[PDB]
Amino acid sequence: MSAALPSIQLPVDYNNLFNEITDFLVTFKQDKGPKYMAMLQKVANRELNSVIIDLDDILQYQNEKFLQGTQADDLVSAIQQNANHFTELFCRAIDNNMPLPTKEIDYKDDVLDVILNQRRLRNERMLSDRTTELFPPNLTRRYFLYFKPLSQNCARRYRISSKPLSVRQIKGDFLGQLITVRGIITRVSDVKPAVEVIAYTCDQCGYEVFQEVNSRTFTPLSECTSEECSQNQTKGQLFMSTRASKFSAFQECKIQELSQQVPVGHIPRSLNIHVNGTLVRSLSPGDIVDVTGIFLPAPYTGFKALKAGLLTETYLEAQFVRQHKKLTSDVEERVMELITSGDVYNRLAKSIAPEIYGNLDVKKALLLLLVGGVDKRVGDGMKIRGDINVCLMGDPGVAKSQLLKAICKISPRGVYTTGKGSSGVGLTAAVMKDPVTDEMILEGGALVLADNGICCIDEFDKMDESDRTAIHEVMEQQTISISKAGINTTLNARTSILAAANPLYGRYNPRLSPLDNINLPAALLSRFDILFLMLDIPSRDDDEKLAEHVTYVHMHNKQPDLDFTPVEPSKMREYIAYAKTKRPVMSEAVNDYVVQAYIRLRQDSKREMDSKFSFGQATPRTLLGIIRLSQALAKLRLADMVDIDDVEEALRLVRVSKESLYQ
């Protein structure tokens, strides 16, 4: 055809590369024989479906082409020029060099085994049944291809195509290439079967018409096109087939930017990514990862005249994922380090949150609750209360938020929350709007996902019309539900609560009455166990030490001191998890020592009867809680010594938690 249909003669052809993949036969002997051919044998016997054709096996192959002084064109040139064209000539090189019958499968022990050979022999016998259509090459693969670039000192050896560029500078000549980008993965869809091959049967001739799969919309053909069931007065009417149609994997995801390499201006934007082969089911929402892959745009094929002129809306196609930042099994050496050194009550107290001034009492009150444990295996239908909850109050200026929430971001499964966002109506799950896919899903808040963990809340005066319901419904055992017009199903409730209520204006006046700033009397004096305070009294010696405390962190950048060896958080996590696998059972002398404790708890609380300072009137709900934390501290410090001294550690804590207001 005329009008500039032919192009200029390009010196870069493909036949010069076509024979250069023919010398990717058994020749690479540096890296037990041909190593990339060794991986070819562990796929044909059907246990793994992902080959890896890296650049390392190309560069070393080009390293030992330093002595053959002949014309060998560059390989990483063309594969960053047009990367997608480097898989179709690749597969047409493997088939001439694939050893087929190297496995042993008799009848079973292979999916889709006797029937493909039944299908192949039904086409092989019909290759000579005249006294004809060859297989398209996509039918018999049962394997995929992959790629992997380099960013090691080989790039500093001698020479780029694998610098981690951001999304921002990428719109130029980087379209149709292989580029890696880091990001944060969001919007994970599901895995749906895509189509790659077809099989129509007409139930007259049985000649299954094959076709290549194009883009996401296509069309079936007629029935008078075949070779046997056609060309007569009767034609078999075509329809589809499921089992004779091989189907692949597919899953869609979207990226954003790291929020540190973004410029001062505009917001970051998304990008579309796809999967093929078997890298599927290996990403997650919240993965600080990077993908390496090849680039191509896509047509739109809808309303293309009025709108959709020459817009492009590209995606990138994935090739490799390099994920990052992830019980008597080669970890017992550090469990012994706590057993040999001992030091439970103090070194572990200095271990969690050593970044404050004083307050060893409250850092001890929390570590017992980070192990929990099954309260009692009740057997009968007596679902007893477990998992006590501690609340705090007071208004320090030491930024109380990063005191508590720093514990939560290292404690297991303990999800952060605040006042805004997941309020007390959206604390549980609900039904909302979704994209054009399956709407009215059960989107959750915190408590339907943070079951049996830490619910670290702040800002207790925020959104209280829904929150005041929300706190009772978890303190009440097992009624986390969705009592909506959609369903009336109820799920579990097993999570501890750590609250920090902020006071009224200025300081909480200690000479005034308490509960001037918390608004829930019924939630507090009967359904909690222990309180604390963060009151500020002027004291000269502490504050200049506190002055050196805050100024020391600025000239240097490090904060550690005071002869404490810092401990890794995995060690106590293993110590908690090992302590959670003990659950000792109490003796009789302990319950003999608490009945006298409760009587002495009863008598003095029944002496004041005043509205000046104190709360509580000695409930058994406080009595059962003091049994709860004792076996908790008997769980973490299990030497099988449930006795008077173990519970003497327990009442040691209830007396110092109480009367924190008397200063």
Binding site: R216, A249, T489
Partner: protein, 282 residues
């Protein structure tokens, strides 16, 4: 024997294989559950439906691995689960005749031999959730554990058609059994009448029930980041109005995928949608 283009399955040895499996059983399966009953559960129950009239046999279907034979039956069951139930529905009606031929005084020997029966294999193998559903699982049994959410009323199915053109009287009833209704283009009920207008008297031919039910998996040991997603159901028999929405579920079903029309007014199509087809629920 008779080998099929579609499957690789056998001929009615499994009928004979079922009878010796069923009759010569009386107890088995103690060897896996060795701790240390003289008649099989199925034998007495086979007499029970005979005098109750019900059409349903809830097969445990965990016996072919506890029986020395019927291994190839057992692994064909997990590999062609549309034909093998259709074979087994012929057996139970004929095995009912095998008890009917003994005493000829058993419900007049006609009416409990016209209404068909059906079987229900369940608890077969195990699965774990939904993040394992690989594309190769095309025609297999799946054992889900999840939550039903909401329902819909029954829409009807096309099991038989009806036709009448503008002659005086024509009451033919064409079958379909496909995705394709086939039509004539010549008249009938006379020897000389042209290609006439054939009309579709829809509200005469009978339809059965069908119901689609939406499911979402129960969030079981989900790693505190993943949202529980969705899948749908399709029932055919009288398991309707018993799967009310809002209860824990364990379904025993096969697998199927369908195409979708991309444009709403064309027949053009390709990310498919799948579902499951329940044989027995719990």
């Amino acid at each position: 024997l008779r080998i099929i283009w579609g499957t690789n399955v056998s001929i009615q040895e499994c009928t004979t294989n079922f009878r010796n499996f069923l009759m010569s059983f009386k107890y088995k399966f103690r060897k896996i559950l060795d701790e240390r009953d003289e008649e099989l559960y199925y034998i007495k129950q086979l007499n029970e439906m005979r005098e109750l009239g019900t059409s349903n046999l809830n097969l445990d279907a965990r016996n072919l691995l506890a029986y020395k034979q019927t291994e190839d039956l057992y692994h064909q069951l997990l590999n062609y689960p549309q034909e093998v139930i259709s074979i087994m529905d012929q057996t139970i009606k004929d095995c009912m005749v095998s008890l009917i031929v003994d005493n000829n005084l058993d419900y007049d020997l006609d009416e409990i031999e016209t209404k068909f029966y059906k079987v229900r294999p369940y608890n077969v193998g195990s699965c774990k959730g939904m993040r394992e559903l690989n594309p190769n699982d095309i025609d297999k049994l799946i054992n889900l554990k999840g939550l039903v959410l909401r329902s819909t009323p029954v829409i009807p199915d096309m099991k038989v058609a009806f036709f009448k053109c503008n002659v005086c009287d024509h009451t033919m009833a064409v079958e379909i059994d496909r995705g394709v209704i086939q039509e004539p283009a010549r008249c009938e009920r006379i020897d000389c009448n042209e290609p006439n207008s054939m009309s579709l008297i829809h509200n005469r031919c009978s339809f059965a029930d069908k119901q689609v039910i939406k499911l979402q998996e129960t969030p079981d040991f989900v790693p505190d980041g993943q949202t529980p997603h969705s899948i749908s159901l399709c029932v055919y028999d009288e398991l309707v109005d018993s799967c009310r929405a809002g209860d824990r579920i364990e379904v025993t079903g096969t697998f199927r995928s369908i195409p979708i029309r991309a444009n709403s007014r064309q027949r053009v199509l390709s990310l498919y949608k799948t579902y499951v087809d329940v044989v027995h629920v719990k």
